[model samples]
Target: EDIDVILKKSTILNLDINNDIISDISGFNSSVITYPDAQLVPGINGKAIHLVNNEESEVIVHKAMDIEYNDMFNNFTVSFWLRVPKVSASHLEQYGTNEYSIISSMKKHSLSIGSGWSVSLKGNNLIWTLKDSAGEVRQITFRDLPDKFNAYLANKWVFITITNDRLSSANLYINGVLMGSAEITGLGAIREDNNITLKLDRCNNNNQYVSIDKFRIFCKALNPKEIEKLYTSYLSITFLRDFWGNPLRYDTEYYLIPVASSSKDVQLKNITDYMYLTNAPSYTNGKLNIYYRRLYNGLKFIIKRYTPNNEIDSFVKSGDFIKLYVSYNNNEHIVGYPKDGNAFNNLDRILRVGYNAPGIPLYKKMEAVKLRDLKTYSVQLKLYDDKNASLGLVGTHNGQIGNDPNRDILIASNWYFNHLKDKILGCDWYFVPTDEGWTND
Candidate 1:
């Protein structure tokens, strides 16, 4: 979506058209056919597909919409930058809010407007209509324009992305901001056909005009972070950096909080949301020691994104204020943190320790903690409401067995303890050899 090297792998059809040819540069290398009146204009990044009042304008992607790619499109994301020039109020009165143009469609026929799934620019609204296996057509529209009639479109280039997961949900983003969402709860199976053609830029009349750039269709339903990166890449480079001096990227869930070194005035800068950084990785010892001011009841969470493969840096605490340095690749900068024994105490203070998709060490640590807490199972269950109970234990339902509760639990516990111990966990396994204290109770 960002024309990135890694993202290109999931791109089933990528149109970063700096050239005249409508070539799909994805690994699939899908074949394409172009229509008349297609113009290559200036884009936010490279060149754009400009279709000006041309009803015959369309780009037909063949193999991409074929049956082989049916399942891929089931959980797909269509991302691109779109610009529709400003329209007069008089023109709006005359047009009467009909669909301006077809952005993209996976329908059986071009003539049948609602036959299958299609994205259309209906007046100021960008609509994504989906036809399910039950032969029902449902849609979610994002009215980007604040006002409908006398709108201020002003030919502004907006980064638009639509992710459709037929079995789950469909989400729409305007300029990287979520505009609309729809669930696929009762949407039936994925509606596909043997000869469903994926068409782009189909205009109704001379009243419609559109320009598209970096048109991409990913094989997966891209998440929020991926969508943010896609849109932000064209704006500016980010200030955030990962532990190893690598660009943390706009796709990360982070904020640049500037804690005033002198005044200690705490302020969240360029802030989106708040989360803590932990100090477990080798990269955090010197220049970057992930710190979290003790929260309610000394509840400490060790949450490092980077693993120990990157050498841990040290840290120093300055009167409740820590001005930590950072590491640049292989440079061995020095800093030692946790100046007191009270730093890691209050294990019972952790009312609930939960993680959605945690790292290896965290996962093992959670399991060990689960076993420790399972000693007083009913008491621990009553401690926190079931809704807010601690997770990463044995699990909700996977603990039922015949004769081996402890053995089965221990097998589930020891993923990193050694030798593909819990292959049934079915996680992508990694070998973290060192005793990172995951084995301890």
Candidate 2:
């Protein structure tokens, strides 16, 4: 599963180091635990390693099976998710004045292999440093930004990545946003003999509490677009309900299309998959106005139930009614078939319609004058689909006691008025199943 993100971008070294919390799509596991103080706990992907007291918990890797290290000959990057503990005197003393390293590479007997760098935190800064074989060091620090190091103190996940170009520069990013960069002066190819092993939470003082998830190493420097894509993939959006207080997930359906504006006319953009409604309180308009190109006799319609307020119920038994109207290119026309339930045609176009239980034949009707020939059109909908529809009630399956013939018949229907606007061309209808009658079962 972690490899999905790795494959999204071009990378050579994706160390898909996942524990037990998530699936082990990556081959690496928590098999090489050192100092064994850290525990496996639920994390963003699967299980994350929680380091409590830097000295007690650490994960070390030497020339292990299926493990890969940096190639100092080319540019490389390292990225991981971390949640650090709040700053405290005891915590500072445990890690000491030296940087609190999140991940680093070193040779056996604690030698600086000069093959990889150190990603750590020093006071209010997030630091990345690498040493050349000559022992000269070049580093980049991200500081002075609003809530820089403090923003990462609490148990909140933050993505940190460092990208270094051999002999050029080193760049640092926090949560996919470029924080800063520094030049890598006097940089040279790392020692060919530097067979360094990677370490996680192996701080110098080894007393700080920190949790790490998704530790990855890349042989190529990731660009800004790739970083942004990784960040956006973790974001989620949720919508609770609708304007009429009905649950949106089951009670409502919507059709969304984009409008491309030009000098002469506003054309409808070609609809595609994955485009849906995104709205807020202030600007809730998500409607599409259409330009009618041509008409067809195939015929379809989209019917939705509407219970306006606590005033009306049981339209069939109470003698009250509902209506359906459409303004085609701003000209009014009936969109569906002529039903037998208390139907009356008015002004050659407008019709007073009623709800019918079971179902009705969707007759294909055409405009007297080629209706689809118009340049543009828009649609509107309303409903009084319940025979015993209550003021506060709709979509309830009431049985017997004089079965209301029109009770749940046409609460909703997805029928297209013409073939040109059919599903093949990406123009289709949508409605909730709650409005369908029992006959559909």
Candidate 3:
């Protein structure tokens, strides 16, 4: 009974390890509103963005189709792991006004200052404030403090969340635990202006030194159980955990045996259901001739096999399996995934987790797995080479991959693997079955 078994795969957005400020999974190429002196640094899970006060630094994610008013203003939850370092006494003096530097801000519209919502730490208190167009403010403060004055300023990583629901009270969570809540009426609609911006580490002209990661904004409010789940996901270094709290660990420590050409290829046989070939992938001369028969004009093929079986078992799991696949000739560039399930793009190679296994071949459309109807599963691939294509294995595991308006597969999108250190994994055409047979070496 391995813990990795029975874990379900899912992701919304993962903001970790991407060297650039651009979001790894969220679809926007301009995800991070870049500024000077903002740098990506090492963090507890993966990497965090460091913003300092002196630089007047801040980053914003423009409101787009993927993120909307309904998903946020009506019922929204914003969560991130943050570490706020104590600033100099002069820093506080810089903001002589009562207002403190904002940890994050989401406004209703492109209105004047103080017309939206913000979360900040004023002295020793954590505050959630929303101001309407009329200048009336609805505010909640954790003034009682968690432990002592300046306890939050102790330079430790803390998971902070602010959830607002028009129908209910706004709630704040610190380290996955509810810290405080406040009731308010007529919070008003978020500004519909396309200029509505979500900024981190800036309030007015003031800024704070903060390290932020795993920052996620959800349209729906998360319950205690879900909040706790997010907390455990970061701490435990696992994804799609079991009902009883066991992690489906990523299989990172497996070795590959070269399927000898003379002997029946064991690798091809195990994955025969997903691969169809008169000959296994072989490197002829200097180039690799990888083939994928276009089932139709737009058909894309993705192959997967359950873990804990006879194949390479990497993690300490039993019931759960890892999903892996290869792509060909620009399927990695096709956009509008999760929506245009029928659309296929040209790609050199691609891989993904929770890939919808095609219910029928020759049809480019993808169908979700109906657990009741699903009986047994096997892997195979039969490819015809219309032209020469490079061969490589692209791994897509569970975690955020990015967002598309149509929910189409994001071609070559990078995602976070469930590793202890939050390693980033995606298609760069690195792992490929070789002329010497398939090897993970």
State the lDDT of candidate 3 residue by residue for 1-441, as single tens digits.
221221111223435556554463644332446667667765554557777665446566555555544433566776777766533334435542345544434443244555556667654456787765566667788753332111344345567877777787789888777988887667665453333333344344444456677766665667777776666666533222211112222422111111111111112212111211122232211121121211111223332333234665323232232343333443321111222232223332222222454652221122112111111111111121123121222222222223422211223221211221322222211111111111111
Query: Any idea what lDDT model 3 has?
Result: 0.41
lDDT for 322 in candidate 1 is 17
Per-residue lDDT of model 1, residues 1-441, tens digit only: 244654666777777674567777776666766777677765554467766665456666666443354543367787877766544344445563666435544553454434346667655567887775557766797765432111223354567898887677889887677879888556665544333233334444455566776777777788888887777776422122221112222112221211111111111111111112222211111221121221111111121222234544321111111111122232222111111111112221111122122332221222111111110111001111123333212211123223423211111111222322342322121111111111111
lDDT, candidate 1, at 240: 20
RMSD of 1: 19.8
lDDT of 2: 0.40
lDDT of each: 0.42, 0.40, 0.41
TM-score of each: 0.48, 0.46, 0.46
Question: Highest lDDT: which candidate?
Answer: 1
Residue ranges of candidate 1 with Cα displaced over 4 Å = 1-6, 64-67, 71-73, 107-115, 147-153, 192-205, 236-441
User: How far off is residue 282 in model 2, in Å?
Assistant: 31
lDDT (10s digit) by residue, model 2, range 185-276: 57775543222223344455444456666666666677777676665454321211111111222112222121111111111111110011
